[PDB]
Each structure stands twice: as structure tokens, then as C-alpha cells.
Amino acid sequence: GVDPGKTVYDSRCASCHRLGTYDASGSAPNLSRAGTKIDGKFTAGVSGHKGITLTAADLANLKTFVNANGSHPQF
Ligand code: HEC
Ligand code: NA
Ligand code: NA
Where is the Cytochrome c domain (predicted)? Predict the structure, then answer.
């Protein structure tokens, strides 16, 4: 789940959000430890937040990515 979750985060939330030290640029909240807020903010297949629609697989993969990476290329 971790790699497709990165694609979800990268293309769909990073433009605004931050995530630990992996992504420290953006004005919206840092999504570190936001799994429960993500699942409350999004319903699988229902268009919502910022025009985004997420599949069930998207939501699971993204949370696995947030848990595993939420960081420096040399660490
Ligand atoms: C800019 C167009 C954004 C995009 C792209 C994403 N998010 Fe967002 N998010 C944005 C703002 C300005 C805010 C604060 C106002 C609000 O609507 O809450 C948020 C907030 C969240 C939250 C809740 C934050 C908290 O309670 O601390 C969550 C859980 C969240 N956003 C999730 C989220 C996800 C999973 C995204 C990728 C699919 C995503 N956002 C994109 C702005 C923007
Ligand atoms: Na960002
Ligand atoms: Na949900």
C-alpha cells in the first residue's frame, strides 16, 4: 500500500498539505498522524474535499503511506 499511497499523497494533497518532514511546504495542516481525520474527511467514492474523490483503495494506500513516511534523502 505504501507506494500507491505515495502517488495519492503526491499528486492529490501535497500541493496544499504538509506531511512530517517528507513534505514541509504548503499552507494546509500537516497530515502526520491524520489517519482518523482522513477517514472522517473522505468517503470512498464520494466527491468532497477540494473537489477530490478517493476510492477505497486510495484511502487505504494513502493512510499506509502517511503512517510509513510521516525524512531525508541521506538519512
Ligand atoms: C488545497 C487545494 C488542498 C488540497 C489539494 C488538499 N487539502 Fe486538505 N485541507 C486544505 C485546507 C485549506 C484545510 C483546512 C480547512 C479545512 O477544510 O479543514 C484542509 C484540511 C484537511 C483535513 C483536516 C485537518 C485537521 O483536522 O487538522 C484533512 C484530514 C485533509 N485536509 C485531508 C486532505 C487529503 C487526504 C488530501 C489529499 C487527498 C487533501 N486534504 C488535499 C487544503 C487542501
Ligand atoms: Na506540500
Ligand atoms: Na471514511
Answer: 2-69
